[PDB]
């Protein structure tokens, strides 16, 4: 949390992967994934992609260094699938930030 903003809650988007197993998987596991992003402020960024990249890395770390505190565990597919949904949310957050 040293230097970050935390965005408000957003409805988790649906991600499609091109297999029914993956779609089904995500849809049943999505409650375990973030619904708010951590990010660094707008004005540190030259462009929206650099913003999104970081926002993904940071959120993912903060969510996993707090779920493992609970007692939770994530498969390597979960983090694949988290990267996907956190990307969309971060894109939404950049969008809120500029409007």
């Amino acid at each position, epitope marked *: 949390l040293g230097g970050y903003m935390l965005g408000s809650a957003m409805s988790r988007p649906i991600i*499609h992967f091109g*297999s*029914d*197993y*993956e*779609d*089904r*998987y995500y849809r*049943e*596991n999505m409650h*375990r994934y973030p619904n708010q992003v951590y990010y660094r402020p707008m004005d540190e960024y030259s462009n929206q992609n650099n913003f999104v990249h970081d926002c993904v890395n940071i959120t993912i770390k903060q969510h996993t260094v707090t779920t493992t505190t609970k007692g*939770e*565990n994530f*498969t390597e*597919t979960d983090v694949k699938m988290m990267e996907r949904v956190v990307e969309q949310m971060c894109i939404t957050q950049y969008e809120r930030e500029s409007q």
Partner: antibody
Amino acid sequence: EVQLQQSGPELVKPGSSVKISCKASRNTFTDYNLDWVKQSHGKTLEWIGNVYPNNGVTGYNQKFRGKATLTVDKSSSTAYMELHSLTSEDSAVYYCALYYYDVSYWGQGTLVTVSS
Amino acid sequence: QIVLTQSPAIMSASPGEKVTMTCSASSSVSYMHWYQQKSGTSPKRWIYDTSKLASGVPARFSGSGSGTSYSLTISSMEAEDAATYFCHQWRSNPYTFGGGTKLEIKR
């Protein structure tokens, strides 16, 4: 490659409960999905619920909440369905179905009879 | 509770015939799956993700579809294919099964 064996056929007195099992044998899939499916009188198939064994998540058909409880045990790659409070309607063949992407494996079915 | 409705309910075909069975959905689904069941054995996935054949399923089989309309086709009807086929969907809890098409060969 993976074998799915399910426990032998049960006979239960009405009002009792039974726990049938199902184990991934020679499974190398870290995660994967286990479907439980009931088939009555040799035709109609109804989805009961599922578990992703490694680790946690459980989903139910509304219809079967309070009827089936689903749990797992990776101290032995075995999944469990507790059927609660059995009536003659619960007499069926209950299937175990492993899904991991392209691969699919269904067990051999466990036949429950609910009788005296 | 997407309702899968298969047709026909029972269907006799002559050998070498093209054979098409349908599965109609109450609401739109993204992929459809098909299982084959011969009496005695347990159901076994036959087609997954609408069009992909499960392992060891013969090549004369195919599936297609989108939205609310999905089909399964045997390009050339063969004795081993005589069985009951069910459709299945993974779009919403509860995942549901078709009523099953029973397919018989003529001889």
